[PDB]
Structures are given as C-alpha cells and as structure tokens.
RNA sequence: AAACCGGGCACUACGGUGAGACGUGAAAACACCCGAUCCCAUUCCGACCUCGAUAUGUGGAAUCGUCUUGCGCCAUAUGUACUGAGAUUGUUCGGGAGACAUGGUCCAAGCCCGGUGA
C-alpha cells in the first residue's frame, strides 16, 4: 500500500541563499582553533600528571603507576534544571 | 620502469605531488638527475608572493609558471607520470590544465 | 615531603554558547542538506497522529544560566553559573593572610604518607566533610605536584609537596559545612579570590 | 551534494533538563518531546 | 556530474524518465 | 551536547584515569553499525522502511560516523538506557554491542509503530576507538 | 663556503623483508590532529581517498627517518648425489649440485628544492 512511495522518496527543493552561503570556512577555522585549544590544554595536563606521579616516592611509584578500575564505575547524573 | 620504451624515446616527463604545505612539480629527463624544469611553491621567490600555497590557486599558478619556464626554455612537449593514487581531477587537474594552456602540448 | 590537597568541582550543567559562526553554519548546513540530500518520506505527511496532546500545557523552559541564585553572586549555593565549572575552596591558616587576602586552601593533610595515598586523601576529605556519600575521586595518581617552602627548605624548614587529587560533584546542596569557618566555591572558574598567583600559574591543572 | 536519504523533523526532547541536538526523520511531525523516569 | 549531460541527451533523443515526476513537482511550483 | 561533553569532561577524565605516553590514545566513538535479521528486501516493505527509520541514512546495511553517530547515539542512550533499561554487552575488545528486539519504546516512534510489529536481530554495535575491554567499559560507563 | 638536516627524483635485494624494544619532532621539514560547503569519497558511510581549513598541538611510536637484536639474499669451504668423454664389461681425465658449514646483511654514487650560520 504505502511502502512504495515512501521507499522511493521525493526530492524536495526550495531556497534562500542567505541560507545557502553562510561561509563554513570560518566555521572550520574556529573549530580547529577550539580543538587545538583543548588539545594544548589536555596535553599540558597529561604532562604535569606524569610529572606528579614521578614526584612521589617508590611507594606510589609502585602503588600509583597502574591504571585503575576504581574510575570505571563513575556514574554521574548530568543536569536536570527542574527537579521532579 | 613506467613507460616500457616503445618506439620513440620521450624524455621530459612531468610529475607533480602535494604536501599539505606546498605544491611541488618537476619535468625530469631520462638522465633523471638534472631536473629539466623544477616548479615548486616552496621556492625562495615563491614562499612570499604565493600566499595560499596548497589549493588549486597555487596549483594552477605553479602550472602556469612552469609552462612558461618551459616554452621559454625550449622543451615544447612533455609526458605526464601521475603517481599511483593520483587522478585527473583537482590538484593535478590544475597542473595539467595550466601547462596545457601555457602553450605546451602533452 | 608530601601533602595531599584534593578539591571538589561542580561540572557545568549546560553548554557554553559558541560563537555565532558555528550555529550559523549548522542551521545553514541543515537547510542545505534539506535542499539536496533530503528526500522526505511519506510524501503525504506524517499522517498517523494524535491531536489532544500537550495535555500538560507547560513546556520545559528551565530559564537557565540566569537563575535568581545567579544574579546575586551566591557562592554559598551551587546555582550560580549553569554553564561554568565550579570549585570548592575553604579558608586556609589565618596566621598569614597571603598577600593581603583571607587565605583559602584545600583540605590538605600533611602526613607521613602511610597508606595508599588516594585512600589517605579521600579520607582527608571524608574527615573534612563528615564522610558523606557524595564524591568521586578519579585516579590513584595525583593531579600535579606543588612544592611548599622550597626556598625555606634551603634552611631546612619543613618541606612538603602537595599532590593534588580531583573529585567531582553529583548533587547541588552542600557537601560539607566548613572546617575553617569559611567555605567558598568559585564562579570565575579560577582561584584568585581563594589563592594568589601560584594557582594563576597552576592553571595548568584546571581548564 | 548527492541525494539519497532523509531526516527533516527538527525534534526537541523533553528530558527535565531540556534536550536539544536531536534531529529526526518522520518530518511533518514537528516536535513530540516526552521523557520519564 | 556527467549524468547531467547524459540525461540532457536522453531527453533530447528520448524523453520521460522519473524526471517526469521530477519536472512534475518542479512545475507544480 | 555529547561531543561538547566528551571534549571537556570525558577525554581528560579518562586521560587522568589512566596512563598513556601521549594524548591521542584515549578511546572514542568511531563508527556505528546496524544489521537486522529479516532475510532481505521483498519480504516486507514497511519492514525495510523500519530498518531505515531510526537511523535515517541506510538502504543496504548501515554504518554511521560523525553527526549521524552523535545524534543517533544520544537518541538511543536516552530512550533505552533511562526508562526501559535494556540489556547490552561489550566485547572484550574494541567492539561494543547491543540489540533492539522491539521499537515501540521512544515517543517519536510510538504513534508510528504500525511499521515495526516484528522482532529484530538488529545487531547494533558501536565500534569505538576502544583498545581494551577495560577502556570499553570505561567509555560506556562514562556515557551513562 | 664544507658540511648537515628535511623534502622530491634516482640508484640498489649485502642496498628486501616482516618483528619487537627503543632514541624521537618544533629549528626547519613531513605526517596527523578538524570539517565536508561547492570538485571528489561510499555500490550505506570523510573508514580510505579528496576538497577546506592548521601560525605552532603529537610523533597515537598511527606511517614516517632514526638505534641496535631479527627478518632473505650475497658470498664462499670440505665433501658427497649427478654427469661429460673414455672401455681394464667403466682401477683414467675432467665438470660438480641439493642439503649440512661459515660469514656479510656494506665500503658507495648522484641531481634538484627548503632550512641550520653561510
């Protein structure tokens, strides 16, 4: 019955070129800016973390060098801006 | 290796490639040491003049530059050796169209 | 030697606005794809339907980032900036008021570093809070190291290196009372209201 | 651009926080947000 | 792509592909 | 909404949680794959339409990357993992998998459910950038 | 300047090839990181290619060039197998592998282009 026209589909079209050329080039720019931003952030963090663990005695050099599973069950409700 | 020499020696092969900072291209001899023509955007005289040194603009520019440095240097024809993943669309289309409209015949 | 200086952080609860270019291109890309890469099904319409709905005539309008607790600069709650990161800092040792400022610090416990140190710092916080069950300490590794009295360690005055840990937030209401008559969260995402330029340079551990 | 697939209903969700960044297929259905426990 | 001119010659010699419905929805408005 | 969360919260979260000589190592959603059970087309037209609907881009099988991945995953993650509580596995490798077995869960669909009306093997597997089952469960624990 | 590094061409199996641990970039270079708008990508999909953007992020040891083990060939030893010409129905004269053994896994050579002080 109504599987024929739905599967075939109809290519719809209508335009506004204000809605056709808003310059994704700036978009690409600002987005690579943001990503390099957060990358520099994260990498400095990484590096001082490795430094931190380094800065401890052999007690944690053997007891804090291993990646751990205690972070694994880190459930965390995200926001709800209206309590139910 | 590529051409499997057939009847008429045809030196001066053009080949081009694209680092995502500069477009480089050469037209090289069968002695294949003395590069008969060498057109790159990395050049001294071309780092500054050419600004956007990785799009089709720098591509076609390098093509035109070369084609003239060729017609004026007396190598009025050349054979193309596209590398394995190339295809005559885009960044090599520009080199090809530019050296073909520079006067040269391929 | 060694201290353990943990801190709590409320993770922001909505998305900070990105520059208009991003949203502009996104709406545009959507409409562009709707021109070409759209071929809508059920050319009639989505005809199967029920009409009497919206039955509870109240949309989900949280009025966000601009709550009343926001317009009054209220550190003592956790309802100021719905799209900024927040941090917990309590009053330091009032002996020195570092560079003419009421010293605020982190629940740092100096100790001989007897047990597993993630445990000793998490217990530091559970002692400073009364051991209430809202917390999460990420890794057994510390955040980063900070030297204390390094120049005064040359005359051998007691030396310790704070190893920061990180915990997060899951609930709004206070996860403490106080330890030093003064608790203050951030809303400027950074620690000058709480501490001098040391943290302004340790901004390589907050983001 | 090439053209074979579609989704056109701009759908906003009804999580109590308020959910955006949802875009769906059945198109003339504009918005039918709802959530629960 | 080239299918554009392919359909050009296709409508020049023959006519009436699914471009019948295409042009139908395009000539409705 | 989701990547906006993965880039500030999650990435450096996992980064501190574990120890990688660099930062590129941390896991992350690569691709999604949906493959149903009903043998193939010509068997039910609205059946194939259903095999299309919740993904929006598919005809033969489907694989999703990019904003397709983000949008689809947030839809799934919220509908199933929050009010019907389904089952879900994660293979002791990069692979992470789950099933559908019905569709009339989500309001979007619920009115237009007339098309599904049949079970599906509907193997939907997220193949992330995971490297060890440890990190896999990290990932889909920290993704609610 | 002599020389070095990087990039392209070239030559080459001792100059290949996996494998693993390394040493790793930013000084410059190459790569990647990020999108998919028109050219391209998919018989679904920026996964691969492409187009578009990186002002100094990473070498994810992703590839990459690097450091040594270890990965085929190259070189040759003693012999035997086989065989040539011979008839003392093979007591002579030549040629001589496969496998076993050993060792090397080069000394070397250009041309352009950017850079390191020049």
Automatic annotation (TrEMBL), chain A:
The membrane spanning regions, by residue number, are none
Under Gene Ontology molecular function, one entry of this record is: copper ion binding
Name one cellular component (GO) term.
mitochondrion
Q: Which residues form the signal peptide?
A: none
The name on file for this protein is: At4g05400
Automatic annotation (TrEMBL), chain B:
SUPFAM superfamilies attached here? Translational machinery components (SSF53137)
Q: Name one GO molecular function term.
A: 5S rRNA binding
Q: Name one GO cellular component term.
A: ribosome
| Gene3D superfamilies per the UniProt record, alphabetical | 3.30.420.100
Keywords noted in UniProt:
Ribonucleoprotein, Ribosomal protein
Gene Ontology terms: biological process: translation
Q: Which domain of life is it from?
A: Eukaryota
Among InterPro entries, the record links this protein to: Ribosomal_L18, Ribosomal_uL18_bac/plant/anim
Query: What does the sequence similarity comment in the record state about its family?
Result: Belongs to the universal ribosomal protein uL18 family.
Recorded protein name is At5g27820
The organism named in the record is Arabidopsis thaliana
UniProtKB/TrEMBL annotation, chain C:
An example Gene Ontology cellular component term from the record? mitochondrial inner membrane
Offer an example of a GO molecular function term for this protein. structural constituent of ribosome
UniProt xrefs under InterPro entries = Ribosomal_mL46, Ribosomal_mL46_NUDIX
Q: What keyword terms does UniProt attach to this protein?
A: Mitochondrion, Ribonucleoprotein, Ribosomal protein, Transit peptide
Broad class of the protein's primary localization: mitochondrion
Subcellular location(s): the record lists: Mitochondrion
Similarity comment: family membership: Belongs to the mitochondrion-specific ribosomal protein mL46 family.
Which PANTHER family does this UniProt record tie to the protein? 39S RIBOSOMAL PROTEIN L46, MITOCHONDRIAL PRECURSOR-RELATED, LARGE RIBOSOMAL SUBUNIT PROTEIN ML46
This protein is called what?
Large ribosomal subunit protein mL46
Which species expresses this protein natively? Arabidopsis thaliana (Mouse-ear cress)
UniProtKB/TrEMBL annotation, chain D:
Q: What is the lineage of its organism?
A: Eukaryota, Viridiplantae, Streptophyta, Embryophyta, Tracheophyta
Which top-level group of life is the source organism from? Eukaryota
List the protein's name.
Ribosomal protein L31
């Amino acid at each position: 019955s109504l599987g024929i026209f739905e599967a075939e589909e109809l290519p719809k079209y209508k335009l506004t070129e204000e809605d056709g050329e808003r310059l994704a080039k700036e978009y690409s720019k600002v987005l690579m800016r943001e990503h390099r931003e957060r990358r520099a952030a994260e990498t400095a963090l990484l590096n001082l973390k490795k430094s931190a663990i380094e800065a401890l005695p052999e007690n944690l050099k053997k007891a804090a060098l291993e990646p751990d599973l205690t972070p694994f069950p880190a459930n965390r409700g995200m926001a709800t801006l209206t309590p139910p | 290796r590529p051409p499997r020499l057939f009847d008429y020696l045809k030196p001066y092969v053009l080949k081009m490639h694209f680092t995502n900072k500069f477009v480089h291209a050469q037209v090289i001899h069968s002695p294949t040491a003395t590069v008969a023509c060498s057109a790159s955007s990395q050049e001294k005289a071309l780092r500054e003049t050419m600004d956007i040194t990785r799009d089709v603009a720098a591509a076609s520019k390098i093509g035109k530059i070369l084609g003239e440095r060729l017609l004026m240097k007396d190598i009025p024809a050349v054979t193309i050796q596209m590398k394995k993943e190339q295809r005559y669309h885009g960044k090599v289309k520009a080199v090809i169209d530019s050296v073909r409209e520079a006067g040269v015949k391929l | 030697k060694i201290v353990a200086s943990v801190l709590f952080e409320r993770l922001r609860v909505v998305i900070p606005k990105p520059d208009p270019a991003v949203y502009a291109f996104q709406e545009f890309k959507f409409n562009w794809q709707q021109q070409f890469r759209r071929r809508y099904p059920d050319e009639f319409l989505d005809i199967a339907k029920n009409r009497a709905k919206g039955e509870y005539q109240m949309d989900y309008v949280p009025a966000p980032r601009i709550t009343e607790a926001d317009k009054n600069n209220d550190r003592k709650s956790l309802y100021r900036a719905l799209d900024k990161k927040l941090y917990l800092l309590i009053f330091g040792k009032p002996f020195g008021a570092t560079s003419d400022k009421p010293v605020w610090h982190f629940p740092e416990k100096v100790y001989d570093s007897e047990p597993t140190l993630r445990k000793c710092a998490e217990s530091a916080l559970k002692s400073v809070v009364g051991d209430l069950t809202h917390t999460y300490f990420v890794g057994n590794a510390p955040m980063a190291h900070m030297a204390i009295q390094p120049t005064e360690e040359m005359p051998d005055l007691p030396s310790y290196k704070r190893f920061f840990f990180k915990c997060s937030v899951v609930a709004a209401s206070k996860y403490d009372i106080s330890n030093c008559e003064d608790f203050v969260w951030v809303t400027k995402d950074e620690l000058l209201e709480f501490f001098p330029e040391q943290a302004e340079f340790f901004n390589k551990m907050i983001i | 651009v090439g053209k074979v697939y579609h989704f056109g209903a701009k759908r906003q969700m009804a999580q109590s926080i308020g959910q955006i960044a949802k875009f769906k297929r059945r198109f003339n259905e504009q918005e039918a947000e709802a959530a629960e426990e | 792509a080239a299918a554009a001119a392919a359909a050009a010659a296709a409508a020049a010699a023959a006519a009436a592909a699914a471009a019948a419905a295409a042009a139908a929805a395009a000539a409705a408005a | 909404p989701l990547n906006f969360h993965y880039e500030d919260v999650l990435r450096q979260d996992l980064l501190l949680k574990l120890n990688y000589a660099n930062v590129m190592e941390v896991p992350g959603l690569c691709e999604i794959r949906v493959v149903p059970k009903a043998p193939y087309n010509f068997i039910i037209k609205n059946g194939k339409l259903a095999m299309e609907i919740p993904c929006g881009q598919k005809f033969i099988q489907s694989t999703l990357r990019g904003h397709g991945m983000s949008n689809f995953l947030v839809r799934i993650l919220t509908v199933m993992s929050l009010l019907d509580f389904p089952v879900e596995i994660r293979k002791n490798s990069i692979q992470f998998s789950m099933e559908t077995e019905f569709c009339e869960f989500s309001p979007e669909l619920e009115d237009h459910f007339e098309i599904f009306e049949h079970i599906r093997g509907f193997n939907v597997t997220i193949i992330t950038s995971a490297n060890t089952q440890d990190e896999t469960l990290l990932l889909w624990s920290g993704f609610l």
